[PDB]
Design a protein around this ligand. Structure first.
Ligand SMILES: [Mg+2]
Ligand SMILES: [Zn+2]
Length: 333
C-alpha cells in the first residue's frame, strides 16, 4: 500500500462541485458523475467536502491531508463493478450525512460516533468483486472455505474489515490517529461492528435488537449508541428506494446488472442461479422495486422512524411516492 502522492491529492482539491449541495436529501450523485470526465475525483471531492463540512475531523486531530489520504486509500480498493464501486460508498456517506444532520440523528450520538459513521461508510464495501456471500459459499471458493473453516459466514463483511484495518495501520491515512485509549478502541470496535451489521442475513435480528433497545428507557446507553450506529449504516446501505424516483431507478439498474453478471458466472459454473440473477427471466424492474419496498425497505424505515428516528420521516414519504410511481409504470404498461 503506497503512500498517496501530492498529485493524486491535487486532482481531488481542484474539484469545486459548482451547483451541488452535498448536504441536501435531493443531491444527485449521477448528475455529479455526469458533470466531468474525472468522476472518481468528483466522488472523492464529495466525500472530502462532507467530512470537512461536518467539522468532525478537525475536532479529533485528523488533518485535511490525512483525511484526503484515507479517502484515496479507500478509492484505490474499490473495483470497476456496476453497483458495489466507489460511487456506492460515497452515496452511503452522503446519505448518512443527511440522516445525521437533516434527520437530526446526530442528537442520539457523540461527535466521535458521527465521525466514525461517516468514515465507516467509505470502508464498508472495500474490494467488493460484485459477488454476494452466497456465491463464495455455493462455489466452495477459497474465501468461502476460509469463512466456513473459521466459523464466520459474513464472507465479504469480514474481508472488508481486514482492508479497513490495513488502511488505518499507516498514520498517513489513519483518520483515528488523533485518538488514544478508550476513544481509539471505540472508534475501531464501532467501525467493525457497523460493517459486520451490513450482512443482510442479520437484517431481521439487527432491526429487532435496535427496536427492543429503543423501546427500553433502561437500555444500556453504550449498547443503544452502538445499535443506533449499526442501524444508520444499514439504513444508508438500503437507502436507494428513499431517493428521488429517477436516482432510485438508476441505482436499481446498476444492482440488476451486477446480479446478472453473478448469475452468468453461476451458470458457467453449474451452481444454483436464483431468478433475480437470471438474464433470461427478464424480470420486471417495477415488480422488483415494489417487492423490495413492500418486504424490506418500507417496514425497516417505518419502524425505526416510529421507534426513535422521527426526523427521518421523509425516507418513509419518498418510499411511498416511489411505490406509487412504480404502480403507475405497471398501470400504463
Ligand atoms: Mg456490503
Ligand atoms: Zn454497501
Amino acid at each position: 500500500v503506497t503512500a498517496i502522492t501530492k498529485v493524486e491529492r491535487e486532482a481531488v482539491l481542484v474539484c469545486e462541485l459548482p451547483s451541488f449541495d452535498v448536504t441536501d436529501v435531493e443531491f444527485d450523485l449521477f448528475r455529479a458523475r455526469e458533470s466531468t470526465d474525472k468522476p472518481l475525483d468528483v466522488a472523492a471531492a464529495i466525500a472530502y467536502r462532507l467530512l470537512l463540512g461536518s467539522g468532525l475531523p478537525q475536532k479529533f486531530g485528523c488533518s485535511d491531508e490525512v483525511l484526503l489520504n484515507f479517502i484515496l486509500q479507500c478509492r484505490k480498493k474499490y473495483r470497476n463493478v456496476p453497483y458495489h464501486n466507489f460511487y456506492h460508498v460515497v452515496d452511503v456517506c452522503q446519505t448518512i450525512h443527511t440522516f445525521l444532520y437533516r434527520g437530526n440523528v446526530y442528537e442520539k450520538l457523540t461527535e466521535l460516533e458521527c465521525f466514525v459513521l461517516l468514515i465507516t461508510a467509505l470502508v464498508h464495501d472495500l474490494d467488493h468483486m460484485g459477488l454476494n456471500n452466497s456465491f463464495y459459499l455455493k462455489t466452495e471458493s477459497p474465501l468461502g472455505i476460509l469463512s466456513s473453516a473459521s466459523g464466520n459466514t459474513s464472507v465479504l463483511e469480514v474481508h472488508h474489515c481486514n482492508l479497513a484495518v490495513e488502511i488505518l495501520s499507516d498514520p498517513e491515512s489513519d483518520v483515528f490517529d488523533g485518538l488514544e485509549g478508550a476513544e481509539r478502541t471505540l472508534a475501531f470496535r464501532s467501525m467493525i461492528d457497523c460493517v459486520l451489521a451490513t450482512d443482510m442475513a442479520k437484517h431481521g435480528s439487527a432491526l429487532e435488537a435496535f427496536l427492543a433497545s429503543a423501546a427500553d428507557q433502561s437500555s444500556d446507553e453504550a449498547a443503544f449508541h452502538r445499535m443506533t450506529m449499526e442501524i444508520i449504516l444499514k439504513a444508508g446501505d438500503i437507502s436507494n428506494v428513499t431517493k428521488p424516483f429517477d436516482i432510485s431507478r438508476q441505482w436499481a439498474m446498476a444492482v440488476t446488472e451486477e446480479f446478472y453478471r453473478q448469475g452468468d458466472m453461476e451458470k458457467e459454473r453449474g451452481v444454483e442461479v436464483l431468478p433475480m440473477f437470471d438474464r433470461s427471466k427478464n424480470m420486471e424492474l417495477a415488480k422488483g422495486q415494489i417487492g423490495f419496498i413492500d418486504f424490506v425497505a418500507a417496514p425497516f424505515f417505518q419502524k425505526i422512524v416510529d421507534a426513535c428516528l422521527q426526523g427521518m420521516q421523509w425516507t418513509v414519504d419518498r418510499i411511498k411516492s416511489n411505490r406509487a410511481q412504480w404502480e403507475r409504470v405497471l398501470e400504463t404498461r
